[PDB]
Amino acid sequence: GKPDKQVSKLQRKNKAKQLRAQRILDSIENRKLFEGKNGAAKIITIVPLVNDLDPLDILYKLLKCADDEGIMVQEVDSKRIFNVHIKKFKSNLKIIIPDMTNFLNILDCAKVADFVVFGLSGVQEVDEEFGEQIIRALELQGIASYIGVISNLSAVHEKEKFQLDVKQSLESYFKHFFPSEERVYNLEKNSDALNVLRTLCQRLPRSINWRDNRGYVVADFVDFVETSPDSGDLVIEGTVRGIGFNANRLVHIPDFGDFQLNKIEKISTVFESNMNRDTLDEYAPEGTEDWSDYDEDFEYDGLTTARYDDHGFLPGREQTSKKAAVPKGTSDYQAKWYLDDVISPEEEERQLREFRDMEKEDREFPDEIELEPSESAIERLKRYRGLKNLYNCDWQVDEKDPSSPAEWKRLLRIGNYKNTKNRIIKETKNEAQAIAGDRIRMFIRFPKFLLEKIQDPKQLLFAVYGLLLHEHKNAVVNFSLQRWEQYDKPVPSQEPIVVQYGVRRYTIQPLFSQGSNSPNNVHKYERFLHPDTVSVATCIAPVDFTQSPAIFFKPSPTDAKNIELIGHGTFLNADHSRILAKRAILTGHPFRFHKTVVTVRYMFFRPEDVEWFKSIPLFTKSGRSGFIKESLGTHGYFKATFDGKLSAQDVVAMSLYKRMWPMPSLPWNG
């Protein structure tokens, strides 16, 4: 075939020099996005973590160490967003200071940044309930390059010997959440200030996955043009960062919604959206046409026994030949032997107490039902199933049920998420008309009446985010869900809980399950979130194709931040194949004992009920299997056989299952 290799000095040196020349070229290309003379836009957001602290001051320091008194004086008058060009390092910074009365405004501010500066107090210890949560939440949603900086250090003792103490304790506090850094810089000293400015100018900012793969424009100027009396064109002048925008793809705007593009112009050509337009509709009308073959439309009314025919008994036929005997007053027995032929604060408090109680009850006793004597067990569980192995038998996704949501057909049924994600992201990269580093006029179609809420792009951040294919289309989504730190409180699986993934926020009544992998993709429905481990939250919500981290919260007006941070996690899967079975356990006491047959008590109250559940297996929390034999009395006592020998301290139980359906979601604003 081919001979071998004997690399010489020269060959080696060259392969090296080439590798490194290539490396250098690529690095220059990747460091050309911030050519601080014409094409740059380094977004630095200033986030103080202490109430008694001023951000304007922090900026004042950084730009007074640039020896530019004018650019400082011109900003005091009226602004909060600035376009500051530093000549010392030749760079185009954009500074953003958040409304520190709005939590979500802080998050929105930082989540667009290339840099996050953290203000720290030498006087006041950071708040456990507010500033700390700023840290953690920023950290979870995504952060590019962050820095730890101080201003209040002079407020302590005048001698450096005591100031450095505070500094270092702050360093060890700051290291805890942000180990990437070890040096909290002091602006009081000219050196450190000059150095942090230096870094902000020079140092290349790392990448945050989800925001960089769909593009974003921070708006400097927002004007409106009337076209029709009821709607017009929002014009947005801003520089594109990230992957870029296409005229056909939709654009999200936070606390406003998803809108479609009409025109885009560049000022570093004109592109207009054509016929390949993504449409402003959730449930695509093609989704109705995709789910056409309804496979199982089973009629539980046409059942004499529990649906379990796959592993149970046989269809027993009870042909009833009822004739009437005419002796006045006579038992059903004599009659059976005469005609035989052969051929607001109070509400919340009470409810919440009850939810804690039901949750702890659900820990001590999982999914058990209490049937009453008057209750006909058959009817009460008539719709249920009774599978032997929950991960082996054949549940199906395409089953029709009056409990199923009307929209279920009209949903975006992605076959494979891992591949679809990659394909569509490559499409977006290739079909990007407007790349990163471009200044853009963006003409978006827009309903007039919302113009009232739109603020000024200089006092309030106005960000413009890109969406990918079909991301406006709803789907069945699975999130990873993990509880926030120091949060003991209960969270049931049907209550409204706001979810932020990407930059989009949707209120969600999510079904909680354990993501334990199953061969039949069937998972236990957990009524309340597990207090220890990662869980899964499934619901009907618009798709996300970059696996954005998700923040779960419930808006609480009382707290400083008008948000109770419940949990976090990630957008896992756009999958419908995940089915969720609400389990239902029936409890019974093993009354009497014979060397192979155990008489069991208080699990039914009619003999016919016992007939109805014959095939369904019996399991004991002692870890033992068994089955029913026949009904003893007219009170529902039933004889039973088992695997091991059970005492009166055991509990005989039945497991019955029902289909649980995901719920529709609505966007969340304000």
Partner 1 sequence: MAKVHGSLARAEKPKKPKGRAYKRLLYTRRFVNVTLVNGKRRMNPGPS
Partner 2 sequence: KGIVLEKLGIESKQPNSAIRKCVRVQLIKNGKKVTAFVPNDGCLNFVD
Partner 3 sequence: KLDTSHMRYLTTDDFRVLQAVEQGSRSHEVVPTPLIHQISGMRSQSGTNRAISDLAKLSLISKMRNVKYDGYRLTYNGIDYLALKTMLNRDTVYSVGNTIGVGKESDIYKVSDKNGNPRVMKIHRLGRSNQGANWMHLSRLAANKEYQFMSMLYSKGFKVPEPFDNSRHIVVMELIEGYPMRRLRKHKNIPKLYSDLMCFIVDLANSGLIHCDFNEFNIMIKDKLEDENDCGFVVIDFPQCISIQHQDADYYFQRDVDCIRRFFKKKLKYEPKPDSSMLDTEGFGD
Which positions lie near partner 3, rule CB under 8 A? 311, 313-315, 343, 388-389, 392, 617, 625, 627, 641, 643
Residue 170 near partner 1 by CB under 8 A: yes
Residue 422 near partner 2 by CB under 8 A: no
Contact flags string 525-544 toward partner 2, x per CB under 8 A = --------xx----------
Residue 178 or residue 619: which is nearer to partner 1 going by CB? 178
Question: Is residue 484 within 8 Å of residue 566, measured between CB atoms?
Answer: yes
Identify what 627 binds: partner 3, partner 2, partner 1, none; CB under 5 to 8 Å per kind. Answer: partner 3
Residue 275 or residue 314: which is nearer to partner 3 going by CB? 314
Residue 156 or residue 454: which is nearer to partner 1 going by CB? 156
Q: Which amino acid is at 417?
A: Y
Identify what 482 binds: partner 2, partner 3, partner 1, none; CB under 5 to 8 Å per kind. Answer: partner 2
Single out the residue of 18, 169, 202, 459 in contact with partner 1 (rule: CB under 8 A). Answer: 169
Identify what 260 binds: partner 3, partner 2, partner 1, none; CB under 5 to 8 Å per kind. Answer: none
Residue 130 or residue 291: which is nearer to partner 1 going by CB? 130
Looking from the CA of 594 toward its CB, the CA atoms found within 13 Å total: 8
- Phi/psi of residue 118, nearest 5 degrees: -110, 120
Residue 49 or residue 508: which is nearer to partner 1 going by CB? 49
3-state DSSP assignment of residue 209: helix
Q: How far is the CB of 19 from partner 2 (least distance, A)?
A: 10
Residue 298 near partner 1 by CB under 8 A: no
CA gap 584, 524 in Å, rounded:
10
Single out the residue of 35, 125, 160, 289 in contact with partner 1 (rule: CB under 8 A). Answer: 125
Residue 73: name the closest of 86, 85, 60 by CA: 60
Residue 109 or residue 134: which is nearer to partner 1 going by CB? 134
Identify what 314 binds: partner 3, partner 2, partner 1, none; CB under 5 to 8 Å per kind. Answer: partner 3
Residue 78 or residue 517: which is nearer to partner 2 going by CB? 517
Q: How many of the other CB atoms lie within 10 Å of CB of 266?
A: 15
The sign of the torsion formed by the CA atoms of 567, 569, 575, 580 equals: negative
CA 8 to chain centre: 56
CA dihedral 201, 204, 208, 214 (to 10 degrees): 90
For the sheet containing 270-272, what is the strand order? 257-259, 251-253, 463-466, 216-228, 231-241, 439-447, 261-266, 270-272
Buried b / exposed e over 271-291, threshold 16 CB at 10 Å, is bebeeeebeeebbbeebeeee
Question: Is residue 239 within 8 Å of residue 226, measured between CB atoms?
Answer: no
Q: How far is the CB of 515 from partner 3 (least distance, A)?
A: 20
Single out the residue of 226, 286, 289, 485 in contact with partner 1 (rule: CB under 8 A). Answer: 485
In the region spanning residues 118 to 157, those forming contacts with partner 2, defined by CB under 8 A, are none
Residue 173 near partner 1 by CB under 8 A: yes
Residue 311 or residue 639: which is nearer to partner 3 going by CB? 311
CA gap 421, 431 in Å, rounded:
15
Q: How far is the CB of 165 from partner 1 (least distance, A)?
A: 5
CA 466 to chain centre: 19
Residue 157 near partner 1 by CB under 8 A: yes
CA distances from 548 to 115, 214, 454, 571 (A): 19, 11, 26, 6
Residue 570 near partner 2 by CB under 8 A: yes
Q: How far is the CB of 570 from partner 2 (least distance, A)?
A: 7
Structure-token pair, residue 623? 């870890």
Q: Where are the beta strands (DSSP E) in 527-603?
A: 535-542, 549-554, 564-574, 579-593, 597-601
Identify what 534 binds: partner 3, partner 1, partner 2, none; CB under 5 to 8 Å per kind. Answer: partner 2
Residue 500: name the closest of 315, 293, 669 by CA: 669
Interface with partner 1 by CB under 8 A: which range of 85-93, 106-114, 160-168, 537-545?
A: 160-168
Binding site for partner 2 (CB under 8 A): 482, 533-534, 570
Binding site for partner 1 (CB under 8 A): 121, 125-126, 128, 132, 157, 162, 165-166, 169-170, 172-173, 176, 485
